[PDB]
Each structure stands twice: as C-alpha cells, then as structure tokens.
Design a protein around this ligand. Structure first.
Ligand SMILES: Nc1nc2c(ncn2[C@@H]2O[C@H](COP(=O)(O)OP(=O)(O)CP(=O)(O)O)[C@@H](O)[C@H]2O)c(=O)[nH]1
Length: 302
RNA sequence: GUUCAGAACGUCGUGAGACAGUUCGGUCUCUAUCCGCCACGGGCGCAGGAGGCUUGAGGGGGGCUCUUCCUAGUACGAGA
C-alpha cells in the first residue's frame, strides 16, 4: 500500500529466451512457497501450460518486502510471454505495467520478436531493461551479444544485468536495478474511482474475477461501482489480493495496486476483456483509452 | 480344383448326347540296388612300435533389428 515506490513490469523476451524459469527463479530468491517451489515455470496454471511448456497466460504475481531497505514489496509481476500469436497480453494486458524486462537471448541473439515488442515499449512510454538470459552455455558472451542491442536493440548496453533465469546470479539486481530504474505509476488520491481492468475470467462459482491496475479510488468491499456500459456490477465485495499460489484475503486496494474486483452480478459479458470506466459518485470524466483485440489474417476452418 | 464313370439346372440339338457354363459326388500303390545326403564304422596307408596333446591349409556355423531415454527437444527455426 501507499503510493510510495513500487512499479509494474512485464517480462518480455523471445521464445525459449527464458521467460518462465527467469520470471520465477527471481521469485524463489526472496520467499513465497516453502518446498514445492516454482517447480516447472511458475504461473503454469490451466494445467495445459505444463506440457509443451508453451507459456500462455500467467500474470497474478504477488510478493512482499523484496527491496533491500527501501520501497519494499513493489514489483507487479507479469509472466506474460509471446511469440507472434498472443501479443494481446504483452500488448494491452501489459500496457498496465510501466516497465517490462527485456530478457534478450544471449545465445541465439536478438530476433524479430524482441525487435517487434521493442517498438511498442518505445512510443508507449516505458522504462525498458535489457539483461542476457541463460549464461551457462558455451556461446553466450553477453559482450558481443550486447553490441546488437546498443546498435540493434533500441538503447545501448546499459548492462542488461546478464544473469539468466535458470540459476545463476539469481538476478539480485532487479530488486536494486529495476527498482531504482523504474518510478511509480501516478497516484490519484482525491478522484473518482477509475480503474482499468486487464484480462478477466469467468464465474463458474463466485462470478467473474477480472484483475487490473487502478489509477485512483480504492474499491472497498461494497462500493456501487460502474463501467460506462450499463454498469450494474455494484455491491462490490473485495479488492482481490493476488498471490503466488491463489486468491487471498486483502483488505482494500487503491491507485496503482494491481488487484482484482469481482462479486455482484457475475454474468459472462459486460466488462469486456478488461476496462472498468470507474466507480460511483462523480468518477473519472473519461473512458480509460484501451486498445483493440484481434482480427487480422490467418483464419481457421473449424 | 480339373480330365473319367453316377446326377441335375441353363441352353444347343428332331435325337443319342454335348458346353474354357455352372452343381454334389468321386480307390493316390510308392520294402532303394546306383549317384547325391546325413550320420557311424570296417581295412589301410602315414616307409623305426605304441600311448597321449594339439596347430590349423581348409570347410561350415553365425551374420537381424526396433523403442524410450542421456548430450538436448540443444544446432537448424521466424514458431510448431
Ligand atoms: N540453465 C538455464 N536454462 C535456461 C535459462 N534460460 C532458459 N533456459 C531453458 O530454456 C527453456 C526456455 O526458458 P523459459 O523462460 O521457461 O521459456 P519461456 O520464455 O517462459 C516460454 P515463452 O517464450 O513462450 O514465454 C526452459 O525450459 C529452460 O530450461 C538459463 O538462464 N539457464
């Protein structure tokens, strides 16, 4: 809590470049989970992610005092990977994060993927960070590999903290690197609840649960919220305190805090892949400018 | 199965019969002399008599292959 320090970031790298073990390896270095560690790439939910190791959707992210005497628990994880297909999450879903790691491959080098997203994280305005991954193999000289970055990967070689996900220096700089590197995401203390839903899900039991980062206005447990479109999901319930295993208690959230908001009128379609306009009582005076989903070439023949 | 005799259908024939048209029936003799072959011996040679142990010309036998897993889902790949 408190608009002090802390920042959001979404890991972004090429396929296999190390976006599973790295995004987790840095987790089992502070706390969370006793024995049954990450196991095989955290966020491996849906069970389907397990096999094929094809990361699809695994955000959540919930840590704590992981900063060496400073801002403390402040690093909205975003295990959102991609490789030309699910650029959605890393697109709009990630847009909610003001800073995404750049785990560029140090063995295979930089590919189109990195050069692709690099453009979005440019004009979109965000604090990019490069850092070679998997530095336990023969050809992995972060040196030369870096040359491409300082002359092919946007900025130069500001020390991508080449540590690599799988084992290694356990990437301890992130807690002291990305922290002091990235600032805070606004605050909004006296304004109308105007959160911006990220992805979302379904009910099946306790209505739908769409998570997202809010700008201003803490939705306590029982606040007649609204989202432009009709908006009848009032009564509220809870802010939704994400974690590394599953939903938790959580008292109340505020601006910036990447949480969820469910309960009251579940339904299936009424909030869209995300968005939530605002709350009640003269809220935001505009709609959180979002983005499109998908509808290009490459169709199907079911 | 088809090539016998019995029998029937179809058709051909005035008729007995007939048809690479079908249909059911319907005795398979097989003591080996020689070559060949498989094993096993008999005489005898091996230029002193016998008892053991072997090399090997040479010849035969044998030679098949799939599946997961490791280096690694790494090189390749812009992914699968
Ligand atoms: N030893 C070691 N292995 C690594 C390292 N980085 C990646 N790997 C290996 O390569 C594979 C790919 O890494 P991982 O981050 O899990 O893939 P991913 O990027 O999350 C999948 P996607 O690209 O779709 O988001 C992993 O199975 C892991 O074993 C590293 O720094 N050290």
């Amino acid at each position: 809590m408190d608009l002090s320090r802390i920042r959001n970031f979404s890991i972004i790298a090429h396929v296999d470049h190390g976006k599973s073990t790295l995004a987790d390896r840095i987790l089992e270095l502070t706390h969370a989970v006793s024995d049954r560690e990450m196991r095989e790439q955290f966020l491996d939910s849906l069970e389907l992610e397990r096999e094929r190791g094809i990361t699809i959707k695994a955000s959540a992210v919930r840590v704590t005092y992981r900063a060496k005497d400073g801002e403390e628990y402040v690093f909205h994880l975003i295990d959102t990977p991609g490789h030309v297909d699910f650029t959605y999450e890393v697109s709009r879903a990630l847009a909610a994060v003001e800073g995404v790691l750049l785990v560029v491959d140090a063995s295979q080098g930089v590919e189109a993927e990195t050069l692709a997203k690099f453009y979005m994280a440019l004009e979109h305005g965000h604090v990019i960070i490069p850092v070679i991954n998997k530095i336990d193999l023969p050809n992995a000289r972060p040196l030369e590999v870096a040359l491409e970055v300082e002359e092919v990967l946007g900025l130069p070689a500001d020390e991508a903290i080449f540590a690599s996900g799988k084992t290694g220096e356990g990437v301890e700089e992130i807690l002291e690197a990305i922290v002091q590197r990235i600032p805070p995401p606004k605050g909004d203390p006296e304004a109308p609840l105007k959160a911006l839903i990220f992805d979302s899900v379904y009910d099946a039991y306790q209505g739908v649960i769409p998570y997202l980062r809010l700008f201003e206005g803490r939705v306590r447990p029982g606040d007649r919220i609204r989202i432009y479109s009709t908006g009848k999901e009032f009564t509220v319930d809870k802010v939704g305190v994400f974690t590394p295993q599953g939903l938790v208690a959580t008292e109340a959230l505020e601006a910036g805090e990447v949480g969820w908001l469910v309960a009251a009128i579940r339904d299936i379609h009424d909030v869209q892949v995300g968005d939530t306009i605002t709350l009640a009582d003269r809220p935001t005076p505009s709609p959180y400018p979002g983005f499109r989903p998908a509808k290009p070439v490459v169709f199907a023949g079911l």
